[PDB]
Point group: C2
Chain length 379, copies 2
Amino acid sequence: KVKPNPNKTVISLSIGDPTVFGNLPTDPEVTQAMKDALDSGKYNGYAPSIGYLSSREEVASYYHCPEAPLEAKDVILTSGCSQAIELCLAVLANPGQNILIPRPGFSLYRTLAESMGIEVKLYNLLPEKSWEIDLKQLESLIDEKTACLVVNNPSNPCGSVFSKRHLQKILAVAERQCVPILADEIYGDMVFSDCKYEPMATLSTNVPILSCGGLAKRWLVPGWRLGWILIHDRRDIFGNEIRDGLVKLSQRILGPCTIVQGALKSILQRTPQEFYQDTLSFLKSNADLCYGALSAIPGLQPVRPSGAMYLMVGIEMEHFPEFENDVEFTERLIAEQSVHCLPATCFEYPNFFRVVITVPEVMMLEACSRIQEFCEQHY
Amino acid sequence: KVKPNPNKTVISLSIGDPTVFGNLPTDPEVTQAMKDALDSGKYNGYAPSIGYLSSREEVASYYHCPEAPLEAKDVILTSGCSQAIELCLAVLANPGQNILIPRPGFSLYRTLAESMGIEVKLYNLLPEKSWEIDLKQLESLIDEKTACLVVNNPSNPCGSVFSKRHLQKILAVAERQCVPILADEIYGDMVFSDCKYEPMATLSTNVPILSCGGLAKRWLVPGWRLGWILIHDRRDIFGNEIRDGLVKLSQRILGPCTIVQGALKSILQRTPQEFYQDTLSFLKSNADLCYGALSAIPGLQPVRPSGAMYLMVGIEMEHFPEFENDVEFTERLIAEQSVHCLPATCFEYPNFFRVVITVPEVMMLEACSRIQEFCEQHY
């Protein structure tokens, strides 16, 4: 809550909202589909709590392939991934049970499982190698009361996209301990690195998955609150016994705004690839600028991101005595420099901070030297 | 689940969605404000979980008067009254506690308090006199574990608007047992009877109220999911100790669609009264038609509604032997006649059914004789 250096333009690197300085507005095809959808006035009344037939039908289509074959009925529409997790949890597990979380991971999985009456077990991401999961951790963090396994790919906060392999390896671990994999993939298709993109379910054969996702992150309409559970029952471990748990639960807050549901068929089919290409294009460059300069600075260890909208830097508490935690670090930083970074304590991973890359480059750059002026005095 | 008489056009009188046959579409000023709000693209990013400053500011203004003085800060925006109840409950009371419900009442208060881990006590509405509350019931249904009192006015399903007096009487009962009054007034200003309209909080002086409300019912955009808690702390029984409970809880599903929030300032200020006048005008006439004809029929006792969009009819199980409950009644009715009425068992009040009046008159009328052809054979 400390005030900035009133003598320097405040630079906020910590907030994930792409649309803050509006250099990432959404495609006018998105904006139109909503207006088109309003204009027909076909969508102002009640829908099923699970969402419109047609809307559900159409998102189901967008994410379909023989490997992970999707049908109208394995789709549920919810007002964001916040629900897509909220519900996805309530159905799999009850108070006094346990789920496998990332470290570092979205501070949300906690605020929920804890607030749902679930006790949390956190597995480990490996900075040394692309923040990939620790397989020892995982295999033997399992329980009797282990309901589930949560995988976030691409990652907030890591910036990471997993290899076509590591994914099969993670899928190897679930059939050896008989556990569900909420695959939080709200960041799906949000990659730019050399490496193409793999939705985790396309690579499954004996593993039950429930996939989150939605507009908020790709189409940069985060305040619009639409999202979907994609169910992926391979081997009838789930069956109708689980599907009803969602249909029943859904009826508590009754899903998303109907305009957004209306406009969904059209947002999916009418958005030009030149929209995405642009987005990820500008998310490589800014990531690379951020990466280079920060890696150039002595005392900080930026881990190159392959996707999503962040990267993690590691504070080498070897030449930084003044500060004794990343918490105090971002703190004197914010006060002295006016640069807002998020202390990675929040993601349950101290000695580190998260920097988003959606901020303009001319700003990434200006903010980058500030950070350097900070470390040629403290490392 | 029985099939209709395939030989008669099915008439659905039981579903509350005004926009089904689209004779109640919303004012094109409503539709515009959304498009205007989309068009500015000012509203696509994250808002406070409690909602936009400005949005919250502006709805606060619309509902302000010295008696019940409202400020920007006593407003929380939520994706409908479904949440406005969900949250309004979670904050006041914990598993193994008790709240005062109507009978008959919205089948929702149950699906929640029960599903929240709250045990439910139902007070009584008086058909003999305008479905007004039973004061004996109320005074002595209270407990140690009585958290709250829920009042629904106007009523779903009753069709009832309470007198300027009964309201003060209900407000007399709360300060004699020290209890909160979630005043579900999602139907606010939805009255047409002689009698003007009183929001319950304007008439309070030593009683804490939390008022639900939103677009769904007045502006006939039910699928749009916006709504508000209006807080009404008179006497600091609430204070900052309760307000935080909402602000904290809100952050679980993070409120409504931002387009809807954007468009809110304009929907409120730019909607012509000729929109409302029309709405309630057509809701008197159809109510009166429905009332007359049904009252004309022998064996049924329609209670005249003063507001909202329904009325209750009472099955005089005095000349209706064939059927032994309202459940079986609507049932043979639906099969033989093709008229969908809702058996008032659902609202926890048997021997009765609910008929909505939003369906076209030429349809109310046709459906009315069908009902008569049904009773000149069964009463």
